């Protein structure tokens, strides 16, 4: 129906904590083919991240049990893990479909482009977490490509403390460590990102500082974990 009605319903869904509905409303809004505002981008991202987040958490619980049994001591665990996986792949595919059909090519500015390319890398990363065989290889390649393009734009267009730039770098470092099994690249990126941002914090207002250091603390937390 009308785009404005879909946005209204997405915001109602959000207040109601109805994230599947929220995502479906935002999908309909994207499909109108107009750009999304900052607010609207965030509605889309929050909705789908809540949906995939539930599936990822469930998949991890089930995969852990499944792995713990395929050592020593029915098909139920496997079967249910497979069901949740298929669901997760469907949601990731839907998001990537929106990004490739509409959002990336229609974005009118640098910030939007980085936002959507990062999302592209993230949803490939979530696919990579559950993938095997040839699927996993092609997914990993796709994630790296998306993240790297986003990184190139962000380095040209955004200051080092910019929260979008910081969050992209954080997630790409997670990719390197968890997905690509490149711990050295992970640490290198996280440390460089942190150091180049620390350099500029003394120039920031209270609110800017809070937004930047939220992400910077996560880079730090990962560095502790990874060393």
């Amino acid at each position: 129906m009308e785009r404005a009605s879909l946005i209204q319903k997405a915001k109602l869904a959000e207040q109601a904590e109805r994230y599947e509905d929220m995502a479906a409303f935002m999908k309909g809004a994207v499909e109108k083919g107009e750009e999304l505002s900052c607010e609207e981008r965030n509605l889309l991202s929050v909705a789908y991240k809540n949906v995939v987040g539930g599936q990822r958490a469930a998949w991890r619980v089930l995969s852990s049990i499944e792995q713990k049994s395929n050592e020593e001591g029915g098909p139920e665990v496997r079967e249910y893990r497979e069901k949740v996986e298929t669901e997760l792949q469907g949601v990731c595919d839907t998001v990537l479909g929106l990004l490739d059909s509409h959002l990336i090519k229609e974005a009118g500015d640098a910030e939007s482009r980085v936002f959507y390319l990062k999302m592209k890398g993230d949803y490939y990363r979530y696919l990579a977490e559950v993938a095997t065989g040839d699927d996993k290889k092609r997914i990993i390649d796709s994630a790296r490509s998306a993240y790297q393009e986003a990184m190139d734009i962000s380095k040209k267009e955004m200051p080092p403390t910019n929260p979008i730039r910081l969050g992209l770098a954080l997630n790409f470092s997670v990719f390197h460590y968890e997905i690509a099994n490149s711990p050295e690249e992970a640490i290198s990126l996280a440390k460089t990102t942190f150091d180049e941002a620390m350099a500029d914090l003394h120039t920031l207002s209270e609110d800017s500082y809070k937004d930047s250091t939220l992400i910077m603390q996560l880079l730090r937390d990962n560095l502790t974990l990874w060393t």
Binding site: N42, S45, V46, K49, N50, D122, L166, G167, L168, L170, N171, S173, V174, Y177, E178, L214, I215, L218, D221, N222, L225, W226
Partner: peptide
């Protein structure tokens, strides 16, 4: 433990 990624508001 799993690595932390960027949060959503």
């Amino acid at each position: 433990d799993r690595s932390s990624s960027a949060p959503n508001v």
